[PDB]
């Protein structure tokens with residue numbers, strides 16, 4: 001199927017995502033949305049029986065999600081339902097009402113399969129290979145243990161934002177009683193890990209709060225890294241704030257009434273898992289469902305050196321992809337030839353290579369200021385499998401090809417672990433020279449270094465590359481000569 | 484063909500552009516560059532005989548231009564040569580040298596054909612119907628009188644930057660004698676007009692100086708508007724400035740030694756033509772050659788309401804047109820139904836409709852912050868046939884969909900002729916509401932207004948559009964009801 005829709009019927013949000021497959025492993029999100037259906041509303045006092053008005057909302061929302069699926073030409077529609085529906089004594093009647101109302105067939109999935117879908121999404125689309133997912137939803141919480149990219153254990157707990165809200169916080173029961181109820185279940189998690197992968201609306205909402213509080217310069221939550229020890233006190237503080245204080249923190253209206261129980265659950269989980277770093281995930285069940293299919297014949301794992309963001313970016317914006325292979329190759333040779341001078345950690349060849357592949361991507365928008373467009377593309381869409389640092393470096397290399405990187409760059413100082421200006425200027429200068437040298441179909445280039453003299457060996461005239469040489473911004477005083 | 488390279492052998496710059504046809508009328512630039520070949524160097528003192536080292540440069544640049552054309556898989560290569568080559572007693576040996584060196588067939592064109600090509604580009608790719616082109620090159624200056632989109636007269640004058648530089652300025656001849664010489668040729672221009680279309684490197688260079696001088700917020704040469712009366716004195720001053728003063732003004736190193744001649748010629752032309760408004764053209768001879776082929780069967784003119792930037796942007800990023808056509812339709816209806824309240828000039832329906840078509844273009848990059856990506860695409864690539872004002876308005880409409888436009892927005896204050904903030908907030912709100920209503924293919928919507936009450940008439944549940952109603956930002960107090 002070229003276009004596939006996933007519908008994730010949660011206990012609070014119902015989510016929709018439309019995926020377009022661009023190659024064997026390349027894909028991107030054509031459309032996504034979520035609706036605050038809260039099918040679980042009022043069910044927890046009636047033995048999980050889904051109530052009439054909430055069921056009516058679900059049907060109406062699901063009908064429009066189906067319309068959206070067909071509006072985008074989906075060849076397949078996969079619909080899964082989690083905690084509130086699987087717990088519900090009348091679950092089979094709701095499934096039947098939905099089928100009769102719109103022809104959608106719902107597959108109730110158990111907690112372990114829900115944990116797996118979140119694990120699959122995070123194991124493949126984040127930048128850490130090992131860790132534990134935390135998928136806090138309105139009705140349940142899933143944790144999947146991931147080790148070097150493979151799922152090793154799945155657990156689902158019957159604690160969720162709306163469950164806690166209706167059983168405890170709505171009744172003005174002391175928050176201590178809710179914490180105990182949560183801890184009693186969180187005790188059952190049989191594993192610990194320095195890394196956690198934060199999944200779901202509570203955690204993404206909390207991540208937006210933290211980004212705003214610390215004036216974070218990158219506006220995308222997929223991959224945002226949270227120091228769990230530093231921030232656990234604030235997370236616990238959120239549990240007891242009132243609605244207007246949450247508003248001042250930036251929480252949107254629709255999320256005000258569930259975020260505090262959600263924050264309580266997250267705090268108990270993080271304490272138990274001994275998490276030190278939580279990475280915010282922009283993906284979860286709906287993406288994992290799609291990947292279960294995409295990767296069904298590949299053991300639910302992208303092959304080594306297969307990155308779906310990189311690949312889909314090239315399918316969308318660079319389908320004649322040999323030029324960029326040459327620039328990458330020359331960037332490698334240049335980096336080796338100059339290593340006596342720059343002595344930069346070869347870990348940064350990773351970023352240089354990718355900037356080599358992507359630096360002319362923005363010409364599909366305009367050939368004027370093309371590198372500025374490439375940088376924009378890279379910063380906003382090179383997401384799966386890249387840290388924010390990885391993205392910022394690659395972005396800067398492309399953005400400042402043939403230019404001086406400012407001292408005052410927000411992205412460059414995004415973190416104290418970022419590479420130095422000089423290192424960034426070196427890699428950008430290398431990218432620039434490689435680009436100049438690959439302008440034509442010049443072949444068999446060789447670089448030698450003697451003192452501060454770079455010599456470019458070629459039997460080609462390289463007339464245009466020689467003409468452009470003075471427009472390079474060198475990282476240090478260095479002479480470039482053509483032999 | 485699909486991919487077409489054009490090479491324009493000027494007397495100073497030699498330019499290359501690779502065009503990609505995406506549809507019957509859609510196209511965009513795959514690649515472009517220019518090389519300071521200056522084939523005319525030293526020819527003016529030897530009756531126009533092209534000199535040996537300049538010809539060698541040309542052969543070396545043109546052989547690599549051919550390589551670039553083939554690298555991009557050009558099916559057709561169109562190569563024309565202008566003043567210095569057409570004037571040269573040895574023109575036929577240079578042409579044959581180039582043919583033997585790389586198989587490029589140079590077609591020497593006379594001054595009228597040169598004026599025609601610039602005219603075709605400007606008549607089609609600029610936003611004014613009538614005016615006179617001013618194409619100052621190294622050897623000659625062309626003017627094409629355009630009226631209502633149609634070429635009515637062509638003249639070529641033997642004044643250019645390198646000609647004047649070598650005949651007068653290089654010899655420390657009083658600038659007065661050079662002006663007198665130019666005035667004698669400009670005298671032959673038999674027409675006048677309030678509008679001028681600026682073509683070539685001199686005028687683009689001057690436009691960049693002016694954009695920097697005035698802290699202009701849109702970094703885009705194409706379409707930039709220059710008050711010729713207010714700036715003529717500054718243009719004339721440029722003629723008397725030193726290299727380093729030109730550097731301080733931002734002039735590129737390669738442009739320093741020709742811009743003063745070019746400014747002298749331009750000031751004389753603007754005075755004679757009575758120009759009050761000059762529009763900087765990002766296109767010229769090379770685009771005119773491509774268009775004369777593209778439009779060979781359409782009398783060198785796009786059909787009414789055919790805009791190649793709009794179309795090509797949709798070809799590249801929106802190969803599915805029916806969604807965006809629905810949003811535009813609702814934007815028109817909403818506009819008309821709300822006009823008792825907003826009372827906005829109907830001239831702005833033009834921008835609203837195009838924002839309706841393009842507002843979700845950016846989702847091809849990311850579905851998160853998609854409207855921000857769309858605005859970026861529009862501001863940087865919606866160029867042919869649009870003023871900077873048109874581009875800015877359309878950009879802002881998409882950018883601030885479902886948001887409040889800040890009071891201090893740089894683009895919004897780009898010029899005093901911009902629409903008011905309130906008008907802009909109105910248009911954005913209409914777009915936002917249209918977008919909500921077209922989420923699903925809600926068919927046959929109708930609108931009525933009573934006082935400040937908008938009533939939406941539908942047979943649809945419009946469940947999701949209602950769920951989103953509170954996130955619209957209204958321009959004035961307004962009640963929205965569904966019947």
Ligand SMILES: Nc1nc2c(ncn2[C@@H]2O[C@H](COP(=O)(O)OP(=O)(O)OP(O)(O)=S)[C@@H](O)[C@H]2O)c(=O)[nH]1
Pocket residue numbers: 204220221222281282283850851852853854855
């Ligand atoms: N699952 C997931 N949600 C995200 C991600 N990034 C943002 N969100 C959330 O998704 C919702 C939509 O954000 P966003 O897409 O930026 O606005 P929008 O309503 O679709 O309007 P737009 O994108 O056309 S500008 C917000 O609630 C945001 O907090 C992500 O990477 N993954």
Ligand SMILES: Nc1nc2c(ncn2[C@@H]2O[C@H](COP(=O)(O)OP(=O)(O)OP(O)(O)=S)[C@@H](O)[C@H]2O)c(=O)[nH]1
Pocket residue numbers: 367368369370371372687704705764765766
């Ligand atoms: N003919 C034409 N030239 C332009 C236009 N805009 C800018 N230029 C000129 O073309 C040259 C390159 O512009 P530009 O493409 O932004 O830099 P670049 O060297 O190619 O580097 P990049 O685009 O990969 S970031 C400069 O001489 C600039 O003034 C335009 O619209 N038309």
Ligand SMILES: [Cl-]
Pocket residue numbers: 200201204205
């Ligand atoms: Cl979310």
Ligand SMILES: [Cl-]
Pocket residue numbers: 683684687688
């Ligand atoms: Cl130019």
Ligand SMILES: [Cl-]
Pocket residue numbers: 682683684766767768769
């Ligand atoms: Cl030009």
Ligand SMILES: [K+]
Pocket residue numbers: 135136137138139140141142200
């Ligand atoms: K969950």
Ligand SMILES: [K+]
Pocket residue numbers: 618619620621622623624625683
């Ligand atoms: K000219």
Ligand SMILES: [Mg+2]
Pocket residue numbers: 010011082136137138200285
């Ligand atoms: Mg869930």
Ligand SMILES: [Mg+2]
Pocket residue numbers: 367368369370
């Ligand atoms: Mg460019």
Ligand SMILES: [Mg+2]
Pocket residue numbers: 493494565618619620621683768
């Ligand atoms: Mg010319």
Ligand SMILES: [Mg+2]
Pocket residue numbers: 850851852853
């Ligand atoms: Mg979005």
